Amino acid sequence: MNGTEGPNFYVPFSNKTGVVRSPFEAPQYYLAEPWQFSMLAAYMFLLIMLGFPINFLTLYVTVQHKKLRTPLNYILLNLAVADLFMVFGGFTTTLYTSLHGYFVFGPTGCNLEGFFATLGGEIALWSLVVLAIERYVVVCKPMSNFRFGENHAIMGVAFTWVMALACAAPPLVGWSRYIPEGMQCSCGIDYYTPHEETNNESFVIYMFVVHFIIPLIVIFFCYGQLVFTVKEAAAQQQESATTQKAEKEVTRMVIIMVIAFLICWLPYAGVAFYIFTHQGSDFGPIFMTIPAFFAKTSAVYNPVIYIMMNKQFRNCMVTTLCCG
Amino acid sequence: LETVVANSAFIAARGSFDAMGEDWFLDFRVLGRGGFGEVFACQMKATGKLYACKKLNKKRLKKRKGYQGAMVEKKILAKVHSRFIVSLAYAFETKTDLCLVMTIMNGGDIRYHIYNVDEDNPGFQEPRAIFYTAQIVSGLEHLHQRNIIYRDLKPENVLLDDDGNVRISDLGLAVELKAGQTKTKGYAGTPGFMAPELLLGEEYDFSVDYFALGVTLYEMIAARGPFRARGEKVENKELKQRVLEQAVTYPDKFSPASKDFCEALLQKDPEKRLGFRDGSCDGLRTHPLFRDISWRQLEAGMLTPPFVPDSRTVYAKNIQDVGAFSTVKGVAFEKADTEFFQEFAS
Numbered sequence: 001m002n003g004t005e006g007p008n009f010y011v012p013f014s015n016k017t018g019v020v021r022s023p024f025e026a027p028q029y030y031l032a033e034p035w036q037f038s039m040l041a042a043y044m045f046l047l048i049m050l051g052f053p054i055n056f057l058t059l060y061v062t063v064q065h066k067k068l069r070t071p072l073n074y075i076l077l078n079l080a081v082a083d084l085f086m087v088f089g090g091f092t093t094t095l096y097t098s099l100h101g102y103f104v105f106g107p108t109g110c111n112l113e114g115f116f117a118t119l120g121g122e123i124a125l126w127s128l129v130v131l132a133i134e135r136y137v138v139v140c141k142p143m144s145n146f147r148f149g150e151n152h153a154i155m156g157v158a159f160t161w162v163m164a165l166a167c168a169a170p171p172l173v174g175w176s177r178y179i180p181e182g183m184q185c186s187c188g189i190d191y192y193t194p195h196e197e198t199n200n201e202s203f204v205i206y207m208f209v210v211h212f213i214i215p216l217i218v219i220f221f222c223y224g225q226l227v228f229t230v231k232e233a234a235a236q237q238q239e240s241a242t243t244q245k246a247e248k249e250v251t252r253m254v255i256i257m258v259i260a261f262l263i264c265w266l267p268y269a270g271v272a273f274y275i276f277t278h279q280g281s282d283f284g285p286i287f288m289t290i291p292a293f294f295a296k297t298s299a300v301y302n303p304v305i306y307i308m309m310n311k312q313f314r315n316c317m318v319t320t321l322c323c324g
Numbered sequence: 325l326e327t328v329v330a331n332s333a334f335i336a337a338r339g340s341f342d343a344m345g346e347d348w349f350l351d352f353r354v355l356g357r358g359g360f361g362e363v364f365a366c367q368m369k370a371t372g373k374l375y376a377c378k379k380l381n382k383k384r385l386k387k388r389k390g391y392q393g394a395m396v397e398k399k400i401l402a403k404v405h406s407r408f409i410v411s412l413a414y415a416f417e418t419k420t421d422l423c424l425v426m427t428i429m430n431g432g433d434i435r436y437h438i439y440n441v442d443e444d445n446p447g448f449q450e451p452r453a454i455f456y457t458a459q460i461v462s463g464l465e466h467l468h469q470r471n472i473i474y475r476d477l478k479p480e481n482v483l484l485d486d487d488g489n490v491r492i493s494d495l496g497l498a499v500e501l502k503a504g505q506t507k508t509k510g511y512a513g514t515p516g517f518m519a520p521e522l523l524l525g526e527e528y529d530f531s532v533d534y535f536a537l538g539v540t541l542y543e544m545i546a547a548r549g550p551f552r553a554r555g556e557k558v559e560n561k562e563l564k565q566r567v568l569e570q571a572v573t574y575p576d577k578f579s580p581a582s583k584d585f586c587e588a589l590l591q592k593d594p595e596k597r598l599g600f601r602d603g604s605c606d607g608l609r610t611h612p613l614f615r616d617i618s619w620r621q622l623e624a625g626m627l628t629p630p631f632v633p634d635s636r637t638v639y640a641k642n643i644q645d646v647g648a649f650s651t652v653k654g655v656a657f658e659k660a661d662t663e664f665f666q667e668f669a670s
């Protein structure tokens with residue numbers, strides 16, 4: 001602890017201006033500046049402008065070719081929807097609020113907004129996990145009686161929602177609470193205290209283990225295996241120069257994929273863990289907006305990595321953009 | 325990238341091979357996108373043998389009303405097993421598609437091989453084409469002995485394995501009519517792989533198969549069919565006119581025997597078309613072309629053509645290579661459709 005405790009707020013900035021009470025309705029200028037709000041608003045604008053076209057394309061491309069409407073694409077559609085939850089739950093709200101210089105939807109609004117943003121990001125998280133699993137199962141062949149057929153695909157999609165709800169729903173029932181994060185113009189998860197009265201401590205442990213560490217292990221496992229397999233395959237089929245280059249490229253891509261998972265959730269995990277292991281921090285309040293920037297950008301980079309670099313989608317997209 | 329990952333899974337399956345439900349076969353990249361559903365390579369999880377799984381998607385089946393064609397292909401392949409007709413191993417359905425799981429022909433198809441030999445090679449060498457043509461003839465003969473008119477035969481339905489022996493497949497384009505009712509009006513087969521008789525909605529018999537054979541050989545050598553050059557991609561009506569009227573230019577790339585054989589078949593009239601004379605299946609066999617063919621060796625599948633596919637050389641398309649055809653626009657199956665789908669499965 002090094003912020004300001006309250007029975008319904010935890011401002012990650014120290015109380016010494018006497019206006020650190022209720023950051024819900026208090027104008028934020030005791031831990032932020034007008035220029036920082038312009039930059040915040042700029043960043044949120046960017047994330048919408050990129051994120052919405054990118055996710056629209058993922059849905060769009062399958063509709064223009066019949067054969068793309070198949071089970072193995074379901075998870076990709078799910079990813080795009082998940083990302084759109086982040087756009088309308090998180091990005092738009094934060095853009096609106098930042099220009100007033102404080103969060104204007106009030107405590108109830110904070111719970112709503114925080115729910116939609118968290119829900120979004122968590123469906124996204126679990127999509128990436130499921131995707132890695134599916135790739136590992138299908139290509140490396142380690143498990144028997146699994147396929148990516150219609151029933152399996154649907155289960156996979158459903159699972160990402162269920163796990164996401166399992167995280168986003170608890171702070172609404174008083175197992176934690178949504179309270180302003182960052183410059184206090186966005187609402188995040190309370191994890192700054194192990195405040196028993198709202199039951200924060202158990203929730204924070206649950207989050208760190210189930211929603212970061214578990215994913216992290218799975219991501220490393222799956223992608224390690226995948227790189228092994230692809231290297232091995234290339235060695236067993238050296239007769240195409242293209243395939244050898246591709247194998248190296250795919251390995252590079254896989255590093256990017258792992259890194260992309262890290263960037264998104266590691267900041268939150270890192271900060272939360274540090275305060276818990278050693279009480280107090282020298283983290284600022286603008287510092288807490290840094291994890292949000294990284295997390296939010298995954299609405300842009302996930303479909304870029306997982307859609308754009310596959311041949312079929314490319315052809316279709318090129319055709320439509322060059323008149324179609 | 326991901327296409328290479330799909331290629332890697334294929335390489336993995338091949339390696340294992342060299343050394344129901346679709347959940348009992350591990351599924352790899354597609355080898356083409358049929359008229360109905362995917363056609364991918366696959367491997368038995370409990371046997372460790374490779375099979376092709378021709379999936380016929382339920383949605384696409386309803387759209388074209390392709391129920392008759394499916395049932396025909398099943399019954400014929402199920403009954404006819406040789407070294408010139410692919411063996412059928414399983415016929416089941418899933419909840420999304422009907423499956424025919426047939427024995428491998430790992431070496432790719434003749435249609436592929438026109439372009440895979442090298443694009444700067446103007447079709448097959450004459451002996452190599454002659455060998456494959458002879459093997460197609462034995463397969464046609466076996467069908468004719470069961471009194472089956474195949475109609476549409478084409479390069480893509482002549483598959484190569486890694487033994488350098490070919491077999492016909494896709495026998496759903498056939499009709500079984502016993503002798504003395506072979507003649508009957510009808511239009512069947514895919515345009516540009518049809519005989520004059522069929523297009524005009526006239527009576528047909530085994531003659532049409534010999535027309536198709538001619539088209540196939542012509543395409544083997546010249547790297548183009550008779551009814552399209554390499555600048556032609558014209559509509560059905562013009563394509564129909566090509567089939568009906570034209571006796572095309574015959575390259576000097578041909579041997580005199582092969583040239584002559586092509587000339588006879590691509591000249592209109594079944595009577596003047598080799599094979600059909602009184603309806604012989606050994607009318608083909610009298611041509612000087614078959615001086616290089618021994619019938620005993622042909623029947624035993626011992627003919628060796630130049631270029632024989634390897635098992636460490638992959639033949640197959642990438643997984644996301646699709647053609648795409650109508651799937652439902654909010655359209656829900658009739659009871660009748662469901663009844664055909666169950667009936668097919670066995």
Ligand SMILES: NC(=O)c1cn([C@@H]2O[C@H](CO)[C@@H](O)[C@H]2O)c2ncnc(N)c12
Pocket residue numbers: 355356357358362363364375376378410426427428429430432433480483493494
């Ligand atoms: N139906 C069959 O018997 C087969 C179809 N294909 C491929 O699937 C493509 C059709 O989509 C064909 O052009 C072949 O490349 C096959 N590939 C290997 N073995 C087979 N028995 C078949």
